[PDB]
Amino acid sequence: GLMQFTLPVRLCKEIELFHFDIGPFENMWPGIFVYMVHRSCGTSCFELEKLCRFIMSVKKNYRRVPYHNWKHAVTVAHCMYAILQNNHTLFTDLERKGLLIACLCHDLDHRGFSNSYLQKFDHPLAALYSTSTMEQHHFSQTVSILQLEGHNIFSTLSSSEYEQVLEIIRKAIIATDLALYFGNRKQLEEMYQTGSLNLNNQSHRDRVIGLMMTACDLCSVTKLWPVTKLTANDIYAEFWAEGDEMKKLGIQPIPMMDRDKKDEVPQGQLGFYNAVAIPCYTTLTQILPPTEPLLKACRDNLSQWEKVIRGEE
Ligand SMILES: Cc1nc2ccccc2nc1OCc1nc(-c2ccccc2)cn1C
Ligand SMILES: [Mg+2]
Ligand SMILES: [Zn+2]
């Protein structure tokens, strides 16, 4: 109870910034996550013995895949932390508890394949969940780990609060299905511009949290250029393995997933930044002004991809 987690000085300072990289030392990621829950939520949000056992069961249920791994989980949660610390007063105590856990859990037991490849492979998970296939699976793995004995971090919630927190996490995890992102931002855009956006409408809050989940999930595009560039190698390593697996089923994969089209990567990032990243962080800054550094960093990395195309790197 009087046992505060601390970090070394450089991390203690850099962790509050949006562009923080959690570093290559795996064994420090749990302490980083616990640090962020204590400062974001409070030291009294979770029984510490339960939290630690939950974190390590979550870690064990991430796979050793090049991108959708334990390190992605902690990164996406760090971004959420930054958003919540920079917009302290706009969020309920249940939202702060739910959303960091949502982020740590959002890709549980990912195999490094898209929803699309699961359906063309005819994976059993595609029979059980017709849309947002992986994302329903991820929420389902979260509930599983919450029901292991000694793992219910939400033990001290009421019957009803428990149900609200599991509902926040469910919607939050579903929202990481990028197919749902496009509609969700268009609606937030129109609601903010017409002046109808209202943060007491629970269905409006839902959309906002959905946008934050996209922002945290894409936060690779808001890092120092060498972090952004090296993360892209891991992202394409999954895409090209999925591309290979499409070819094994006798299907020409889209060029994004075709390793014979490495050459077009810089233009593919340009497309992604203009179609998804910029619009995501633009709409997010409008609704939550202190998130501006995510937009400014995204615009910087776009300019870095333009430089790659021009043969200046
Ligand atoms: C989906 C996607 N998700 C991301 C999540 C985080 C960070 C970067 C991301 N980039 C992405 O996509 C990148 C892309 N490459 C191509 C492409 C590449 C080579 C040849 C032809 C096309 C197209 N598109 C959209
Ligand atoms: Mg996912
Ligand atoms: Zn993710």
Question: What angle separates helix 159-175 from helix 133-146, to the nearest 10 degrees?
Answer: 150
**Sole residue written with tokens 């959309």:** 207
Q: Is residue 13 part of a domain?
A: no
Those residues whose C-beta lies under 8 Å from the C-beta of residue 4, and which sit 6 or more positions away, are 38, 43
- Ion ligand 2 neighbours, Cβ < 5 Å: 107, 176
Q: Is residue 18 part of a domain?
A: no
Is 78 annotated in the active site?
no
Q: Is residue 232 part of a domain?
A: yes
User: Contact at 8 Å (CB) between 307 and 273?
Assistant: no
Q: Where residue 150 sits, what CATH number does that domain have?
A: 1.10.1300.10
Q: Is 72 annotated as a binding residue?
A: yes
Q: Is residue 113 part of a domain?
A: yes
* Neighbour tally for 201: CB within 10 Å: 12
* Neighbour tally for 66: CB within 10 Å: 16
Q: Is residue 128 part of a domain?
A: yes
Burial class (CB in 10 A: 0-12, 13-18, 19+), 27: exposed
Domain enclosing residue 196, as ranges: 28-310
The approach used to solve this structure was X-ray
Nearest to 298 by CA among 210, 203, 217, 228: 228
Q: Is residue 14 part of a domain?
A: no
Structure tokens at 180: 């749902």
User: Contact at 8 Å (CB) between 79 and 18?
Assistant: yes
User: Contact at 8 Å (CB) between 140 and 133?
Assistant: no
Q: What is the DSSP letter of 67?
A: S
CB burial readout 121-141, b (16+ within 10 A) else e: eebebbeebeebbbbbbbbbb
Q: Is residue 179 part of a domain?
A: yes
Nearest to 299 by CA among 278, 269, 272, 270: 278
Q: Is 267 annotated as a binding residue?
A: no
Nearest to 215 by CA among 98, 95, 58, 84: 84
Q: What is the number of domains present in the chain?
A: 1
Q: Could you give the CA distance from residue 297 to residue 54 in angstroms, rounded to a whole number?
A: 33
**CA distances (Å), origin 108, targets 2, 111, 168, 234, 295:** 32, 9, 17, 18, 27
For residue 210, how far is its CA from the centre of ligand 2 (angstroms)? 13
Q: Could you give the CA distance from residue 243 to residue 251 in angstroms, rounded to a whole number?
A: 9
Strand positions, DSSP E, 92-188 = none
Q: Could you give the CA distance from residue 189 to residue 65 in angstroms, rounded to a whole number?
A: 35
Q: What is the structure's resolution, reported in angstroms to one decimal?
A: 2.4
Q: Is residue 19 part of a domain?
A: no
Q: Ligand 1 pocket by C-beta < 6 Å: which residues?
A: 218, 220-221, 235, 255-256, 261, 264-265, 268-269, 271-272
